[PDB]
UniProtKB/Swiss-Prot annotation, chain A:
One of its GO terms (cellular component) is proteasome storage granule. The keyword Cell division does not apply. Keywords: Acetylation, Cytoplasm, Nucleus, Proteasome. The keyword Acetylation applies. It is found in: Cytoplasm; Nucleus. The proteasome degrades poly-ubiquitinated proteins in the cytoplasm and in the nucleus. It is essential for the regulated turnover of proteins and for the removal of misfolded proteins. The proteasome is a multicatalytic proteinase complex that is characterized by its ability to cleave peptides with Arg, Phe, Tyr, Leu, and Glu adjacent to the leaving group at neutral or slightly basic pH. It has an ATP-dependent proteolytic activity. Disulfide bonds: none annotated. Belongs to the peptidase T1A family. One of its GO terms (biological process) is proteasome-mediated ubiquitin-dependent protein catabolic process. This is Probable proteasome subunit alpha type-7.
UniProtKB/Swiss-Prot annotation, chain B:
The keyword Cytoplasm applies. This is Proteasome subunit beta type-7. Pfam families: Proteasome. Non-catalytic component of the proteasome which degrades poly-ubiquitinated proteins in the cytoplasm and in the nucleus. It is essential for the regulated turnover of proteins and for the removal of misfolded proteins. The proteasome is a multicatalytic proteinase complex that is characterized by its ability to cleave peptides with Arg, Phe, Tyr, Leu, and Glu adjacent to the leaving group at neutral or slightly basic pH. It has an ATP-dependent proteolytic activity. PRE3 and PRE4 are necessary for the peptidyl-glutamyl-peptide-hydrolyzing activity. Present with 16900 molecules/cell in log phase SD medium. It comes from the Eukaryota. Transmembrane segments: none annotated. GO terms for cellular component: cytosol; nucleus; proteasome complex; proteasome core complex, beta-subunit complex; proteasome storage granule. GO terms for biological process: proteasomal ubiquitin-independent protein catabolic process; proteasome assembly; proteasome-mediated ubiquitin-dependent protein catabolic process. Keywords: Cytoplasm, Nucleus, Proteasome. CDD domains: proteasome_beta_type_4.
Length: 244, 233
């Protein structure tokens, strides 16, 4: 029969969870955001649609930090994203409190994974309406991750989600091929600013604001920091230049 | 209700024209046993605040963790975390004061005597005390435990009232404190010769000095003292 897509934890005859799939639609309908893993860190960038001149520029920050070494960005229902980060934060504090050392990216990824997967187990809750790109630096390297509404996640070289994910993924795949030795934090920041401008074509109708953040063992000391002022503008230009 | 096991003695401090100075020795006593010697009891928070702690060391370490968290938490979704929305010494103090009073009210105190020293964003000096009872107060000079009896009298000879702060220089102030640390080493049976000192100046920022030592002590006259009354040799 039908109706398998009305309740959250229900398996359809083909073994799918339709509500999770519908959640994905909310994600695809969102702003595009990405992540790039460099030789000693990671970079995060996102597209901020400027609905109107009334939006105070640079004020509505979307990228969020967890603990002090992790960055998270997401596409979809923004509130759901914050909800997931609040949890990640408790999750990270709990881990540090007990083990003293700040939470490793892999460990952190699974904490978010189990929580998101948890929201696909009952019909009393709705799945998360966001895909989240996050990561940072830890005891042994940099790590990048992307988490789907199903709770599914993997480690990535580069990642993208949202409206222009295809453009972005395409650009990311190029970089991967043309740089088997690894991009640098400095380069990734520019490369990231570009990918976002390019991927902005799938929404070229509205004007936007660029946002970047990074966590590099050499550039930020393994701490997550927002790209501001000069470094930001320099990246804006690098993009504005290669968009023509 | 509990009882302190490993403890830190005095924490002395005072304010001068451009900031505040605070110091504490590096000892962690275990009753009459001077057990640990590399204990830092001055906890810097950001770059405008230093929290000096005396009393139970396990609780001190717990307050340390609480303080690191405040910093982490304040940074969350805060684009002005290192500017207009950074932690003020007064915020850090009100927080601890709140905790200290709640813990005494549950009959399970953090067995400490704390002094928060720092400079507000508008340059004002900040110096306030809070202890295991949740009791709090401010004064041009503040010392805990033993130093309350021996350090305050000395430091107050430099800054006796509010009008004395603008007339006091970092040099005079640091001098007074360093001398007080020596006196405490002379008469406090739970003190150490090594100590840390920190200065928070509205211009020079936070200066944290580690591994200081009491120097220029007078002991020579001890040779002329024999017996306890009538003995001559």
């Amino acid at each position: 029969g039908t109706g398998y897509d009305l309740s959250n934890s229900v398996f359809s005859p083909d073994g799918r969870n339709f509500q999770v799939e519908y959640a994905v639609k909310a994600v695809e309908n969102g702003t595009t955001s990405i992540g790039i893993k460099c030789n000693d860190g990671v970079v995060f960038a996102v597209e901020k649609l400027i609905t109107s001149k009334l939006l105070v520029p640079q004020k509505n920050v979307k990228i969020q930090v967890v603990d002090r070494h992790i960055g998270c960005v997401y596409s979809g229902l923004i509130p759901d994203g914050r909800h997931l980060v609040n949890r990640g934060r408790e999750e990270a504090a709990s881990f540090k409190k007990l083990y003293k050392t700040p939470i490793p990216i892999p460990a952190f990824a699974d904490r978010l994974g189990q929580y998101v997967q948890a929201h696909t187990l009952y019909n009393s809750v709705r799945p998360f309406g966001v895909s989240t790109i996050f990561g940072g630096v830890d005891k042994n390297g940099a790590h990048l991750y992307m988490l789907e509404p199903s709770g599914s996640y993997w480690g990535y070289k580069g990642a993208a989600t949202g409206k222009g994910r295809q453009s972005a993924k395409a650009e990311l795949e190029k970089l991967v091929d043309h740089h088997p030795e690894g991009l640098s934090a400095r380069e990734a920041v520019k490369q990231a600013a570009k990918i976002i401008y390019l991927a902005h074509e799938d929404n070229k109708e509205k004007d936007f604001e660029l946002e970047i953040s990074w966590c590099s063992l050499s550039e930020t000391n393994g701490l997550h920091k927002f790209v501001k002022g000069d470094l930001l503008q320099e990246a804006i230009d690098f993009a504005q230049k290669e968009i023509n | 209700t509990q009882q302190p096991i490993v403890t830190g003695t005095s924490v002395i401090s005072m304010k001068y024209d451009n900031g505040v100075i605070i110091a504490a020795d590096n000892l962690g006593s275990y009753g009459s046993l001077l057990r640990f010697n590399g204990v830092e009891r001055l906890i810097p928070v950001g770059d405008n605040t230093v929290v000096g702690i005396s009393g139970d060391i396990s609780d001190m370490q717990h307050i340390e963790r609480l303080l690191k968290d405040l910093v982490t938490e304040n940074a969350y979704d805060n684009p002005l975390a290192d500017a207009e929305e950074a932690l003020e010494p007064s915020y850090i103090f009100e927080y601890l004061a709140t905790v200290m009073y709640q813990r005494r009210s549950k009959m399970n105190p953090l067995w400490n005597a704390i002094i928060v020293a720092g400079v507000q964003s508008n340059g004002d000096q900040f110096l306030r005390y809070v202890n295991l009872l949740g009791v709090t107060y401010s004064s041009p000079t503040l010392a805990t435990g033993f130093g309350a009896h021996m350090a305050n009298p000395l430091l107050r000879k430099v800054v006796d009232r509010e009008s004395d702060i603008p007339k006091t220089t970092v040099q005079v102030a640091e001098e007074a404190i360093v001398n007080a640390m020596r006196v405490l080493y002379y008469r406090d049976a739970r003190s150490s010769r090594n100590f840390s000192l920190a200065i928070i100046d509205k211009n020079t920022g936070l200066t944290f000095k580690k591994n200081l030592q009491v120097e220029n002590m007078k002991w020579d006259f001890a040779k002329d003292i024999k017996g306890y009354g009538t003995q001559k040799i």
